[PDB]
Design a protein around this ligand. Structure first.
Ligand SMILES: c1ccc(Cn2ccnc2)cc1
Ligand SMILES: [Zn+2]
Length: 309
């Protein structure tokens, strides 16, 4: 169920690293705390970019107001579903908000956390647009969904109530909406793959959920293959990212509200975290571009194999 070497090198060749970097990543690297103008502008940028894709995605916002330590705040999740008619979908997710820090420092823009995840999803959707479009026209049975969640980060301290505002809301919302066969939109998620903390040098990923280990093994195999095919940079050893064995640690994140409702999850998060995590140095200059593009190639092959593109 793997690509022939020919399909694979063509798929990798559809990626455009400058597009990823300049068209998708750079515009996100602004302060975008919930309720801010910057957050609103990034939301509108994601929406408009997704609506421009030629495949003709269904794009909708999930807006809500919630109580926070800062008083009422308005949040909005961006939900892009390629074929709303389809029974089920692979869902790829990330958070688009940036963590609020108090005034008086260099602004926190969360390059790894999660501007790079956001940009990867946009690049994958654009690079595979012709294949995705063809699949949707063929009424392919499993479509693609991209979620850009708001309010992942705590506004003032992490706990079950000041965190995950967007994902908690969206999971409850999906539970309340009928789908066919469903019976609700929660059952339409065939797999929930959450990208977080990506773009630093030397990431390490582990399988967080035995239920989904087969897909983790697929990612590891694709890393090894692309290494052997001379398609990964600054990758001097065949397995570097996808590590076998017990996880370093689990991480509370936007998958939790879905996991608790029985959705299968793969958590694609570096553990240990980037050295710059939750400091103002989590910026563009501290990203490692070759790693970002390595991950984009791994993910593009994964996506084409998962969906038969
Ligand atoms: C502790 C608690 C929660 C997290 C979740 N997280 C992920 C990205 N930024 C924050 C990480 C560590
Ligand atoms: Zn964070």
């Amino acid at each position: 169920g793997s690509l022939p070497e020919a399909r694979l090198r063509r798929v990798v060749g559809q990626l455009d690293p400058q597009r990823l970097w300049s068209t998708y990543l750079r515009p996100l690297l602004v302060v975008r705390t919930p309720g801010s103008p910057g957050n609103l502008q990034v939301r509108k940028f994601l929406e408009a970019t997704l609506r421009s894709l030629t495949a003709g995605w269904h794009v909708e916002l999930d807006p809500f107001t919630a109580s926070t330590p800062l008083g009422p705040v308005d949040f909005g999740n961006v939900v892009a579903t390629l074929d709303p008619r389809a029974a089920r979908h692979l869902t790829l997710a990330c958070h688009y908000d940036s963590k609020l820090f108090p005034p008086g420092s260099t602004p926190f823009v969360g390059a790894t956390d999660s501007a790079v995840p956001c940009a990867l999803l946009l690049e994958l959707a654009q690079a595979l647009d012709l294949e995705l479009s063809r699949a949707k026209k063929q009424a392919a049975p499993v479509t693609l969904q991209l979620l850009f969640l708001d309010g992942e980060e705590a506004l003032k301290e992490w706990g079950p109530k000041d965190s995950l505002y967007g994902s908690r809301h969206l999971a409850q919302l999906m539970e309340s909406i009928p789908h066919s066969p469903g019976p609700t939109r929660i059952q339409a998620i065939e797999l929930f793959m959450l990208l977080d903390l990506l773009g630093a040098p030397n990431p390490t990923f582990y399988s967080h959920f035995p239920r989904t280990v087969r897909w983790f093994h697929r990612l590891r195999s694709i890393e090894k293959r692309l290494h052997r095919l001379n398609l990964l940079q600054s990758h001097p050893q065949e397995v570097m990212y996808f590590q076998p064995g017990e996880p370093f640690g689990s991480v509370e994140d936007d998958h939790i509200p879905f996991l608790r409702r029985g959705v299968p999850v793969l958590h694609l998060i570096s553990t240990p975290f980037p050295a710059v995590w939750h400091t103002p140095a989590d910026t563009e200059v501290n990203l490692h571009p070759p790693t970002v593009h390595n991950l984009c190639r791994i993910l593009a092959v994964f996506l084409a194999e998962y969906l038969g593109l």
